[PDB]
Design a protein around this ligand. Structure first.
Ligand SMILES: *[C@@H]1O[C@H](CO)[C@@H](O)[C@H](O)[C@H]1NC(C)=O
Ligand SMILES: *[C@@H]1O[C@H](CO)[C@@H](O)[C@H](O)[C@H]1NC(C)=O
Lengths: 213, 221, 198, 49
């Protein structure tokens, strides 16, 4: 009744990529299977219909078959236009409704190691007049996109009230993230200093701010 | 053919939402239109289809009574309405179209979707529409910016010097707080010599709440 | 039997047993109606002792038939752009069908000796195949809405026939009679015999 | 006598002599095939006399 699929797939250029999509005995075989591809930030489009039939305007590098129970396909080669996820679809007699897979985002397999840039900002005076305080730590220009944010109050780390973002791609294929610490204005003055520690690839960059500049 | 849909809308948990898809370039009287939903973190989930000429409709087991079907062949539009939507309905709506007539249940195994409509994005989260609060970040090569605090919902647009300053401008992605309100910051890299001469003003605009705040960033001694 | 002529012209009007010309004189006791749709090449298959598609695998007809069939074109209603997939047939089955027997299943045929049993592949295919009605298709693939108006002999008190006027009868006179479809010449006299109320 | 049904639907299937329903039971000694093409109005012309 459920149609499993791996979250993502990887493959070097000019090499076949294996995509797995398996279902139940009534989901596959009893009814035909269908495949669709979705552009990023757009609408999905039909790719493969009627089992092994190939439509006009779609090239021949897509070879797909449902086998007996698990539907698997491979792509001859890899290009930059093939960086789209694929959805496998089939009909279920017991559920009486269509089912779809999770999707496999094919990634084309360069950027060297870069130290992250950390900029920590003190809470604004206008925000402090509104009985609020927020520490803004900004992380930019690091590769690969895997960082861990640690907040230190003098010598005691703090865990309550921290909100961090997932790493997102920049314009120059770099990664960036931001961390926010909601703080009591009475607690900001009572501490000597606040530090934002960013751990990236075993290297830590720490910026320290003070209530008295 | 052309299959236009309604634009992006914002909503509140427990409320009702209504979207419509218009059919053009083909005969509406004998071509079915299917409704599918795509939420982030998972794949497509099927909802149902509507008969354009007849009135019989079929729904999924999870959405048997939650969804409603309305049609009007005079203007060739399909009206999709949802009542008592849950908090996890933040997704996009596609007015998928299939060739031929598939009013019966048994024709779905030979049925495929050829053309798809545009994504009707709806944002649902446990929060009310509240205007943002903008405060400057004084510099301490210099870094200055503005933090967009306590706004709902997405999105916000930030610009520097009304679009004149475009080099070194980075807009960070939003974050989800424990109170249900979003936070965002945007920093720009400027030379340290041009701090006491040039004026840097952040232009924060929030279209869902119709709030536009222009805050000037000044250094603090 | 007069409001069915304004629908559409009839491609065929064959009638085994009862002749169409005299549907008003007879009076039956029960009327059977079997409605389905066929394509243009499939019209001749609605006949006793036929095979291949319908009278062997889908809708078996008995050897003796005294009913009528009505066929007409329905290009204006059922035929759609790029065909209609609602109407199906069964092509694969292990055995034949008894007359007037309806079958339905979600199982798939086992053509060969391989025990597939729910998995499609070689020697295991779906028995139901869809057929479409495209405008580009010829007369051999067109929607032909047909009905099977099955009948039977007079072995019961008659119920359904035409609105013929029933005049008052006379006794002890040489007068023709028409009692529920049967006609003859004679006299009607009261008899002292006994008939069980059934 | 099973692969000919998957080709195309049959406009006519009239059979003189042998009945189409029982081709499996008998066993013949000589099979002759004569293939040609005709128009729609000449379908009925394939008949004796
Ligand atoms: C069939 O019913 C429709 C419904 O109003 C009617 O318009 C049409 O004339 C009918 N067809 C006949 C009486 O042949
Ligand atoms: C006739 O032969 C061709 C040759 O490959 C094949 O593709 C086609 O399916 C055949 N027709 C049948 C089996 O009806």
């Amino acid at each position: 009744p459920v149609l499993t699929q791996p979250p993502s797939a990887s493959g070097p250029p000019g090499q076949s990529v294996s995509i797995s999509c398996s279902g139940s005995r009534s989901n596959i075989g009893t009814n035909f299977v269908y495949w669709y591809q979705q552009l990023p930030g757009a609408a999905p489009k039909l790719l493969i219909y009627k089992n092994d039939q190939r439509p006009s305007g779609v090239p021949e590098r897509f070879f797909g078959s449902k086998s007996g129970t698990s539907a698997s396909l491979a792509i001859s080669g890899l290009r930059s236009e093939d960086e789209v996820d694929y959805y496998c679809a089939a009909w279920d007699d017991s559920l009486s409704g269509h089912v779809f897979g999770a999707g496999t985002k094919v990634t084309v397999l360069g950027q060297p190691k870069a130290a992250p840039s950390v900029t920590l900002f003190p809470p604004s005076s206008e925000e402090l007049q509104a009985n609020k305080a927020t520490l803004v730590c900004l992380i930019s220009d690091f590769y690969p996109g895997a960082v861990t944010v640690a907040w230190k109050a003098d010598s005691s780390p703090v865990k309550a009230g921290v909100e961090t973002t997932t790493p997102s791609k920049q314009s120059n294929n770099k990664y960036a993230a931001s961390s926010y610490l909601s703080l009591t204005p009475e607690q900001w003055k009572s501490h000597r200093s606040y530090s934002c520690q960013v751990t990236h690839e075993g290297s830590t960059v720490e910026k320290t701010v003070a209530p008295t500049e | 053919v052309q299959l236009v849909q309604s634009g992006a809308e914002v909503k509140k948990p427990g409320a009702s939402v209504k979207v419509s898809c218009k059919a053009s370039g083909y005969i509406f009287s004998d071509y079915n239109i299917h409704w599918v939903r795509q939420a982030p973190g998972q794949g497509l989930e099927w909802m149902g289809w509507i008969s354009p000429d007849s009135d019989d409709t079929n729904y999924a087991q999870s959405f048997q009574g939650r969804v409603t079907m309305t049609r009007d062949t005079s203007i060739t539009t399909v009206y999709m309405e949802l009542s008592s939507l849950r908090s996890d309905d933040t997704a996009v709506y596609f007015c998928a179209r299939s060739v031929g007539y598939c009013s019966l249940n048994s024709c779905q195994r030979w049925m495929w979707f050829d053309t798809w409509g545009q994504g009707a994005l709806v944002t649902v989260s446990s929060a009310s529409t509240k205007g943002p609060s903008v405060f400057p970040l004084a510099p301490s090569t210099a870094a200055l910016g503005c933090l967009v605090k306590d706004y709902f919902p997405e999105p916000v647009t930030v610009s520097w010097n009304s679009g004149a300053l475009t080099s070194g401008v980075h807009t960070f992605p939003a974050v989800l707080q424990s109170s249900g309100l979003y936070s965002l910051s945007s920093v720009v890299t400027v030379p340290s010599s041009s701090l006491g001469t040039q004026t840097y003003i952040c232009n924060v605009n929030h279209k869902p709440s119709n709030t536009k705040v222009d805050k000037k960033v000044e250094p603090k001694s | 039997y007069s409001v069915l002529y304004n629908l559409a012209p009839f491609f065929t009007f064959k009638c085994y047993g009862v002749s169409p010309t005299k549907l008003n004189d007879l009076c039956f006791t029960n009327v059977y109606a079997d409605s389905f749709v066929i394509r243009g090449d499939e019209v001749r298959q609605i006949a006793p002792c036929q095979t291949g598609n319908i009278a062997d695998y889908n809708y078996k007809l008995p050897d003796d038939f005294t009913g009528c069939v009505i066929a007409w074109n329905s290009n204006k209603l059922d035929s759609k752009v790029s065909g209609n997939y609602n109407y199906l047939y069964r092509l694969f089955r292990k055995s034949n069908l008894k007359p007037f027997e309806r079958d339905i299943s979600t199982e798939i045929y086992q053509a060969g000796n391989k025990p597939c049993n729910g998995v499609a592949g070689f020697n295991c295919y779906f028995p139901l195949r869809s057929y479409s009605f495209r405008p580009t298709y010829g007369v051999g693939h067109q929607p032909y809405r047909v009905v099977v108006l099955s009948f039977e002999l007079l072995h019961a008190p008659a119920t359904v026939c035409g609105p013929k006027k029933s005049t008052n009868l006379v006794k002890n006179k040489c007068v023709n009679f028409n009692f529920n479809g049967l006609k003859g010449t004679g006299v009607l006299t009261e008899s002292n015999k006994k008939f069980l109320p059934f």
